[PDB]
Antibody
């Protein structure tokens, strides 16, 4: 593997700062141009700045927008890259990308970390199990679901049960409504279970909670 | 700085075809043009660098070419795993600027949605509100229109609707529709319908539960 894993994301309030770090493995980190890009929601990808390789010293380039406010550093012992972001504004919310080789042939992007720069506070989800009305509907394959209402900031993961006989799990992206997030997931299962054996959704919202809810009835 | 423009943000091709997606630069770029693939999740792979060069790993079904201001990526024979949004970025002048992107949807045979509709949980209801949820599953095409009727009247305030991106394994979409109300507005009505209108049918396809029923 040639890993590059990004890590300082989360919620910051406006005017605040955050240290983003990028971990790498399986190549000579000193050899490569190391770059930070971001994608705001909606918008196109936006390059923020790179740092050169030992050849070139480890000299840095930055875009007009972030120069003086963001700063890229490098540690070549641990083989961590950093992006110190200051005086963060709401427009700085985005998925941020760590990248090896900007200029072509050895390209490798990590998967992003999400920052929300906002003045709202963390809200854990209320999780509801969704089961159909008794009497009134089934056939062959049962669809169960889970509504995870009212959490903030993003990303929630809903786990179910993994045993591919059906289990057509769906994830419906979160939508903001009245300043909180809401998402759902479904699982559809063969009717030979549910009733019969348990299905649970677990909702992990890393600004601290796990809830696990059972589809009873 | 140079504005990269991708005319066309959505495209649909059946797989068997030859896709071409354009990128125009606002300044002459002297061939420092790179093409990327962004999957629905995170990931972002560089497919071609310097107008034409394939990065190792990339299938020979992808070709890049073009000059001055105007460039093209061609996918000679579209494969199911090619659904993604394709991006170009100029690397000729700082700062580096990326095109908007073109999403590539796989054209598929139409599939009719399978509707599912759920009553509020005892848990939400005992906690003051009620949300009636309607999963409308696995259909094609993307375009579909759900309307919630309570006791026979369409409801406007309180509907959330989100779709999944195209399915990786079978190329359909699913959508969730949620109507939220008070425990009290809810205790006052009986029929709750979710009426979906889609390419595959002439008449709305409806699911309902009467709350009196159960």
């Amino acid at each position: 593997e040639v890993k590059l894993v990004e890590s300082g994301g989360g919620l910051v309030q406006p005017g605040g700062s955050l240290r983003l770090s990028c971990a790498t493995s399986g190549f000579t980190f000193t050899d490569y141009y190391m770059s930070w890009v971001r994608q705001p929601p909606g918008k196109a990808l936006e390059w923020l700045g790179f740092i050169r390789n030992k050849a070139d010293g480890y000299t840095t380039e930055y875009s007009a927008s972030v120069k003086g406010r963001f700063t890229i550093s490098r540690d070549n012992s641990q083989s961590i890259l950093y992006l110190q972001m200051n005086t963060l504004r709401a427009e700085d919310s985005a998925t941020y990308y760590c990248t090896r080789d900007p200029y072509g042939p050895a390209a490798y992007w990590g998967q992003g970390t999400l920052v929300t720069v906002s003045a709202a506070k963390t809200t854990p989800p209320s999780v509801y199990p969704l089961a159909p009305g008794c009497g009134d509907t089934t056939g062959s394959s049962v669809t169960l679901g889970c509504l995870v209402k009212g959490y903030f900031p993003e990303s929630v993961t809903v786990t179910w049960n993994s045993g591919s006989l059906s289990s057509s799990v769906h994830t419906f992206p979160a939508l903001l409504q009245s300043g909180l997030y809401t998402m759902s997931s479904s699982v559809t299962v063969p009717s030979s279970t549910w009733p019969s054996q348990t299905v649970t959704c677990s909702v992990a919202h890393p600004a601290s909670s796990t809830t696990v809810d059972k589809k009873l009835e | 700085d140079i504005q990269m423009t991708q005319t066309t943000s959505s495209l649909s091709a059946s797989l068997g075809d030859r896709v071409t997606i354009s990128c125009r630069a606002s300044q002459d770029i002297y061939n420092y043009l790179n093409w990327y693939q962004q999957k629905p999740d995170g990931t972002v792979k560089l497919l071609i660098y310097y107008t034409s060069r394939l990065h190792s790993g990339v299938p020979s079904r992808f070709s890049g070419s073009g000059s001055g201001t105007d460039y093209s990526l061609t996918i000679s024979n579209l494969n199911q795993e090619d659904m993604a949004t394709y991006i170009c970025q100029q690397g000729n002048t700082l700062p580096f600027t990326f095109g908007s992107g073109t999403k590539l949807e796989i054209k598929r045979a139409d599939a009719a949605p399978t509707v599912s509709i759920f009553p509020p949980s005892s848990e939400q209801l005992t906690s003051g509100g009620a949300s009636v949820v309607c999963f409308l599953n696995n259909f094609y095409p993307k375009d579909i229109n759900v309307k919630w009727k309570i006791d026979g009247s369409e409801r406007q305030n309180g509907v959330l609707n989100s779709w999944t991106d195209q399915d990786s394994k079978d190329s359909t979409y699913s959508m969730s529709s949620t109507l939220t109300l008070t425990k009290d507005e809810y205790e006052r009505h009986n029929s709750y319908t979710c009426e979906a209108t889609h390419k595959t049918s002439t008449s709305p396809i409806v699911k309902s539960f009467n709350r009196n029923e159960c």
